[PDB]
Design a protein around this ligand. Structure first.
Ligand SMILES: O=c1ccn([C@@H]2O[C@H](COP(=O)(O)OP(=O)(O)OP(=O)(O)O)[C@@H](O)[C@H]2O)c(=O)[nH]1
Lengths: 139, 139, 357, 266, 157
RNA sequence: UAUGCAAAUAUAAAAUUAUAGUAAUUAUAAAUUAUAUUAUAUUAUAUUUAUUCAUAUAAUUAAUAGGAUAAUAUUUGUAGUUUUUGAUACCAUGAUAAGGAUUAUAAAUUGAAAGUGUUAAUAUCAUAAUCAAAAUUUAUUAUUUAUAUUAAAUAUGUAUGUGUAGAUAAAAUAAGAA
């Protein structure tokens, strides 16, 4: 019986929490601008070839096989699409002359392996990406 | 230990498993999760054509609201008018004293951090401070 | 067990106990019940009949030829549930200018009844001159022998009640059984209008005469509206007619007297604006109506209010009373013995104990 | 050592009946002789109790827009109410008024007997919003403050019985109450017609009927709220003769006589 | 009030009445709110009569009316808490602490079945009961069969 | 560790204790109570799999009142303030759970009664209750591992590091184990 009021939050905590929230919002603004810049630059920059050079369709020498078709028919548009996996797969679908061979028989490098830059030559590159950028794993 | 009236009335019953997306008390601790590519599709209305929620407008002959609703989406007038904007949050409230144009079109709950990283060193007890130090949250 | 009760219809344990029918035993009807056939209640509705006419009907029925001939004139007179808003003097002038032309006593009487009804609806008090011009010479004067039509007499009564005229008695006395004997054909609406008009006019003997005639002729007191009865019973002040009202109030039903009390209370209180003319203060009649309603209604039990001041016997509560008189019992016994004669008559008795107060 | 929730109350009947009625004992309930209901509360206490009925969006709640306090203490931290003028700067003002809350009679059936969007369920029977005065529901004066205690809330005093009565409503309860309390027959015996607001609709129906547009005539007849006069029914019936629409004529006659005070008994 | 002469053993039992009232408010507002929501966010033209500005202006006006509707029942059913009517114990639908047919909590159900207060039949705890649909496909199959019995059985006009 | 110094239970007795005065009898017995399979014999046990586990919020519970096609009620619109005091922010009797070790094949089920927050007598400032958009520090909880990855109620930005210490979880039932 006879309830009494009991403080729960610190006496000076409220204003400190307010200013911490304001500073966090400003830091989030800065990080958002940085992440937008990095995402746009990643999307525009050319990436590595997303096809495995160790499987049946992409095994021939660069002077034969599907590589001749790629170099003489759809070479121009690969630079415009910047070798991203989704546009290259869509272009391979639309070009024909391959049929279901891009899915029933072909294979592609994983999602985090196909996002490496044009020249990497190293496995640990995917872990060298900036961490303060909140681009959700898009360099 | 959260202190509320419902804490005594109800029981946590351990780490019980709830139906998908049907927890009783919603606590969107992930509202402030940053994602630059998904900036317009995270914790926001799915369609760009949708109007702003009712909570962004005044309906009746009001006399005044102490704080605006969290779902109220920040607009240009919020910063341009230079008025007073407050959002209810732990512990008491968060006031927008730093009007910025980078948060136009985003919900105030998305802008405000629910789970504040700051920890009060005042109300913490001896055992609780020892626990926080052991966890590493406190020196 | 617990504060919350157990419903036996839903609880299977009660339904399958030895005091009810188990599910293994055959399920069949036992002792068929006929309640609506052995004693069927009459239909009494809490809400009044919505489709009721709620007015006095004049039973307008004339020859079709005369009706169609007077159709241009009769459009202004009220029809069945249709009331034109023509000025009353216009129809009065039309009647006084065209009645001698049409040669039919019954048609003239019906037309005059419609004129009276219209002027009563408009509350125009100037139409009594029409009655004195046409009907007074032959229907009621120095022992008039004529038999007026029921429609005409009912219309005249409605008009006089609406205008609160003082000439209604000369016609009602003729309408008693020894004269025209039109009392049994009066509608309950007519009776209610008469009672309300007399209550407003404050006639002490009129209310008594009307109530006695209604009881004699078996008018439906229950269907007579409560407000008219309340207004009629508010105006009685003389002791004799008040006693008559007291003894007559037992004729009404229990629900009727309860709602009479309710209407009287609300009208002399909050519903004072409901009446166009405010009701006079008659606290004697108000108190008697409330008391009679309390008598007629079933009596509940309120033990705390009934026995708030109850005190036990002196001998019964002597142990629990620190200062109580016990020699009073001995004094009562001595008085009883003296009355019986065993003790000497009127013997001097001295106090047996000290007076502690 | 006497404590009381309310320190003052008022009676129901004024000083014209109680002074005479006090001499007649009243059989009060044996286990609670003294009763104190919402209709017995003082003005300020009743207002402050009715404000707290609504969970939110009500005057009782500290932050609902209709509060009147200058400041509110929150977790041992004072806060100042943002006034309506300052809110208006960044909150666009949309306000129609009492007309927005109310809905038409034709939509009352679809809304399940409710013509008001107010968060307190308004019942047209004179027993649920039973203050000292009988419960009368207004239409163009509906407001959040609601000065007349005609709505139903589930937090005020002596509300459990009213809630039970509301839940035990029969079919067509509100519709029947609205009909019987709005379209009552006149005392003088005249049908409840000649309504000034409803008059143009009758003329439109008559024009369509005499123009032979019976389908549109009925489609506008269904919009009639009060009881139409005998002219509408006679025109509608006379429209069926050229088309030999005996079915529709009989339906019109039934709808006229069986239900609406025998208007079509002509 | 204020626990002076309380009649019900539990104060929280009144929340059951409050929940019934909120369900009745939902019954009132479920058509108007749905119609306003459907009209507001329909990008395609409604018909030949209303197109372009005559449609967009109407959508704005109906959205304004919906916002001005004070007390509209916005909240969905699944977010309304379920409280037992016998002992005022809260249970959340979808878990095991609430039964759908009796609308009482797990504790109340256990008490009523252990006593005699609800005619139920016992089945094996680790089986599919005795229902053919439950044996066939389970909860989802019986749910779909309820849908089929209700709506899909009828060849709608 | 017997050479000297040393009578000593093998019993002629009179309720306990006590110097043969102190207290009021004193002792003793039987039954029962959780510690000890034995090595053919009422059963071969011995294999597979797994382990970074977290969430609760903005106060008023103590009445009945009937409407169309019914032989008539304005009961349209029913109006009497104030003497009581507990399941509420302690306490305010009882009651359901989890926990496999010996009654077995056979026309057969591998889940227990010894008690788990809410429930029926002790009172004596108690307005703590969801109707959305919310605040991890709390024992009792199986998460998706590297070809293609965010569209409708808003729904998780974090921890790549030799299948990797300690400690620990599960299964002999349409499955495959002697
Ligand atoms: O039973 C009732 C109820 C109510 N009223 C209401 O009384 C109002 C007039 O008030 P009065 O009823 O006092 O006037 P009156 O004697 O002239 O009335 P009638 O006999 O001519 O009807 C009328 O407008 C009516 O609504 C009654 O007349 N009777």
């Amino acid at each position: 019986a006879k309830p009494k009021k009991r403080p729960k939050v610190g006496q000076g905590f409220h204003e400190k929490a307010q200013k911490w929230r304001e500073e966090y919002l400003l830091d989030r603004h800065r990080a958002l601008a940085d992440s937008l810049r990095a995402y746009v630059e990643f999307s525009t920059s050319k990436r590595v070839e997303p096809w495995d050079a160790r499987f049946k369709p992409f095994d021939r020498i660069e002077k034969d096989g599907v590589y001749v078709l790629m170099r003489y028919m759809m070479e121009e548009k690969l630079q415009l699409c910047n070798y991203h996996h989704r546009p290259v797969k869509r272009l391979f679908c639309n070009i024909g002359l391959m049929g279901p061979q891009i899915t029933t028989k072909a294979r592609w490098k994983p999602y985090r392996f196909a996002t490496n830059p044009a020249g990497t030559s190293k496995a640990e590159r995917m872990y060298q990406r900036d961490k303060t950028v909140y681009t959700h794993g898009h360099n | 230990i959260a202190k509320s009236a419902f804490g005594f009335y109800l029981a946590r019953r351990g780490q019980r498993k709830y139906p998908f997306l049907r927890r009783p008390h919603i606590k969107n601790t992930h509202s402030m999760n940053p994602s630059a590519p998904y900036f317009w599709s995270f914790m926001t209305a799915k369609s760009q054509m949708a109007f702003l929620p009712e909570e962004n407008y005044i309906t009746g002959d009001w006399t005044g609201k102490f704080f605006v609703s969290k779902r109220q989406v920040y607009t240009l007038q919020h910063a341009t008018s230079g008025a007073k904007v407050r959002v209810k949050s732990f512990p008491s409230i968060f006031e927008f004293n730093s009007p910025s144009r980078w948060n136009i079109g985003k919900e105030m709950n998305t802008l405000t951090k629910p789970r504040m990283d700051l920890i009060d060193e005042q109300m913490l007890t001896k055992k609780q401070r020892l626990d926080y130090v052991r966890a590493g949250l406190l020196p | 067990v617990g504060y919350t009760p157990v419903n036996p219809d839903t609880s299977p344990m009660v339904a399958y106990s030895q005091y009810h029918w188990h599910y293994n035993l055959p399920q069949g009807m036992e002792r068929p019940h006929s309640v609506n056939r052995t004693f069927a209640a009459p239909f009494q509705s809490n809400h009044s009949l919505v489709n009721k006419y709620r007015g006095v009907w004049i039973e307008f029925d004339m020859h079709p030829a005369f009706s169609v001939a007077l159709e241009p004139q009769l459009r202004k007179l009220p029809r069945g549930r249709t009331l034109p808003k023509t000025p009353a003097e216009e129809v009065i002038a039309d009647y006084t200018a065209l009645a001698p032309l049409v040669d039919d006593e019954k048609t003239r009487d019906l037309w005059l009844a419609k004129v009276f009804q219209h002027c009563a609806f408009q509350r125009c008090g100037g139409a009594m001159e029409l009655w004195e011009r046409y009907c007074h010479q032959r229907f009621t004067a120095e022992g008039a022998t004529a038999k007026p039509p029921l429609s005409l007499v009912k219309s005249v009564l409605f008009y006089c009640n609406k205008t609160d005229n003082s000439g209604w008695r000369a016609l009602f006395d003729r309408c008693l059984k020894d004269g025209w004997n039109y009392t049994p054909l009066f509608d309950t609406a007519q009776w209610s209008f008469m009672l309300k008009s007399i209550g407003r006019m404050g006639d002490e003997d009129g209310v008594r005469a009307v109530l006695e005639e209604m009881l004699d002729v078996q008018a439906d007191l229950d269907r007579v509206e409560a407000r008219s009865v309340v207004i009629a019973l508010n105006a009685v002040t003389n002791a004799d007619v008040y006693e008559f009202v007291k003894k007559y109030l037992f004729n009404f039903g229990e629900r009727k007297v309860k709602f009479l009390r309710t209407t009287y209370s609300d009208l002399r209180g909050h519903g004072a604006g409901k009446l166009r003319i405010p009701l006079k203060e008659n606290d004697n009649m108000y108190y008697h109506v409330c008391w009679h309603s309390s008598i007629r209604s079933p009596r509940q039990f309120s033990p705390r209010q009934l026995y708030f001041d109850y005190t036990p016997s002196t001998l019964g509560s002597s142990s629990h009373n620190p200062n109580a008189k016990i020699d009073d019992i001995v004094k009562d016994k001595i008085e009883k013995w003296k009355a019986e004669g065993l003790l000497p008559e009127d013997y001097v008795h001295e106090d047996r104990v000290y007076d502690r107060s | 050592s006497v404590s009381g929730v309310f320190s003052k109350g008022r009676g129901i009947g004024h000083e014209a009946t109680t002074s005479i009625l006090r001499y007649i004992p009243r059989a009060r309930v044996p286990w609670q002789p003294s009763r104190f209901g919402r209709e017995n509360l003082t003005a300020a206490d009743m207002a402050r109790l009715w404000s707290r009925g609504r969970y939110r969006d009500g005057p009782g709640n500290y932050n609902s827009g209709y509060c009147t306090e200058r400041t509110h203490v929150l977790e041992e931290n004072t806060v100042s109410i943002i006034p309506r003028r300052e809110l208006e700067k960044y909150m666009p003002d949309i306000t129609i008024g009492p007309k927005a809350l109310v809905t038409p009679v034709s939509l009352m059936n679809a809304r399940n007997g409710h013509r008001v969007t107010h968060d307190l369920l308004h019942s047209y029977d004179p027993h649920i919003g039973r203050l000292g005065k009988p419960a009368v529901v207004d239409h163009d004066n509906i407001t959040v403050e609601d000065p007349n205690r005609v709505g139903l809330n589930a937090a005020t005093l002596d509300c459990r019985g009213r809630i039970y009565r509301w839940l035990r409503r029969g079919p067509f309860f509100q519709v029947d109450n609205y009909f019987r309390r709005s379209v009552k027959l006149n005392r003088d015996g005249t049908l409840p017609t000649d309504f000034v607001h409803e008059a143009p609709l009758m003329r439109k129906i008559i024009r369509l009927a005499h123009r032979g547009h019976l389908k549109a005539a009925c489609e506008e007849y269904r919009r009639v709220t009060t009881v139409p006069p005998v002219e509408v029914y006679r025109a509608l019936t006379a429209c069926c003769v050229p088309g030999a629409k005996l079915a529709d004529a009989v339906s019109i006659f039934e709808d006229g006589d069986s239900k609406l005070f025998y208007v079509s008994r002509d | 009030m204020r626990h002076i002469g309380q009649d019900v053993p539990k104060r929280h039992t009144h929340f059951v009445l409050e929940s019934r009232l909120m369900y009745e408010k939902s019954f009132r507002d479920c058509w108007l709110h749905s119609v306003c929501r459907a009209i507001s966010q329909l990008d395609e033209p409604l018909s030949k009569t209303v197109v372009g500005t005559h449609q967009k202006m109407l959508q704005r006006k109906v959205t304004c009316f919906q916002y001005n509707q004070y007390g509209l029942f916005k909240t969905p059913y699944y977010r309304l808490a379920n409280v037992d009517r016998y002992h005022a114990v809260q249970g959340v639908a979808g878990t095991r602490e609430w039964v759908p047919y009796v609308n009482v909590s797990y504790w109340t159900m256990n008490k009523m079945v252990r006593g005699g207060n609800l005619l139920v039949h016992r089945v094996h705890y680790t089986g599919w009961g005795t229902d053919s649909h439950l044996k066939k496909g389970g909860w989802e199959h019986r749910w779909n069969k309820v849908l089929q019995r209700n709506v899909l059985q009828y060849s709608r006009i």
